[PDB]
Structures are given as structure tokens and as C-alpha cells.
Amino acid sequence: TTISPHDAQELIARGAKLIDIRDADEYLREHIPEADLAPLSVLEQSGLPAKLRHEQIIFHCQAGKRTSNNADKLAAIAAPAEIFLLEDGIDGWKKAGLPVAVN
């Protein structure tokens, strides 16, 4: 299931984890302040660490593609949470007028 940036904000205000699945170099250039970084490759190797588990988990990447294309991987990695994909990624978040942190 996809979630709008504004609806994601409301879930994050209730404790939902926002997980950035991009690489560290991408994150460092520009990220969502509320997000926790966990590159997809690392998640595929060692799983989601306990500190990033919650009842509600929202994954995001750049523009919606890596989340859409790895939907089954992400559904398993965060199971048994309620899982969302941020619609249009950080690009969508920016287009919605929500804050980002730029290097």
C-alpha cells in the first residue's frame, strides 16, 4: 500500500518508522529529517534491526521505483508490521512541501 507524504506525517507523529532504503551518499546529500537510513542491500543481508521495528513501518526511496519493484522483499523484511511505501519517494515528499535536509 502506498501512503501520501501528508498521511505518512500523521503516522510518524504516532511513532511509525520512516525507513530510507537508499545509500548513505544519497542520504547525506538530501534526506527526510524523520527518516532512519537502512540501505536495501543491508536489509536483504542482515534484516531489519530491532531498533527500527514498530507496529507501522513506511519505506521510501528516491522517486517510488525501488519500493514498487522490491515490494515483496520489503513486505518480508518488515513483517509482521503494517507496511507502507511512500508515494513517489523523497521526490514526492518534496513536491508536497514537506521539509528535507540538504548538505
Dist. CA 103–CA 99, nearest whole Å: 13
**Residue from 19, 61, 74, 77 carrying the catalytic annotation:** 61
* Active-site annotation holds for 79: no
CA-nearest of 59, 57, 60 to 90 is: 60
Q: Grid coordinates standing for 73?
A: 522483499
CA-nearest of 12, 88, 20, 24 to 48 is: 20
Dist. CA 64–CA 51, nearest whole Å: 24
Any idea which residues carry the catalytic annotation? 61
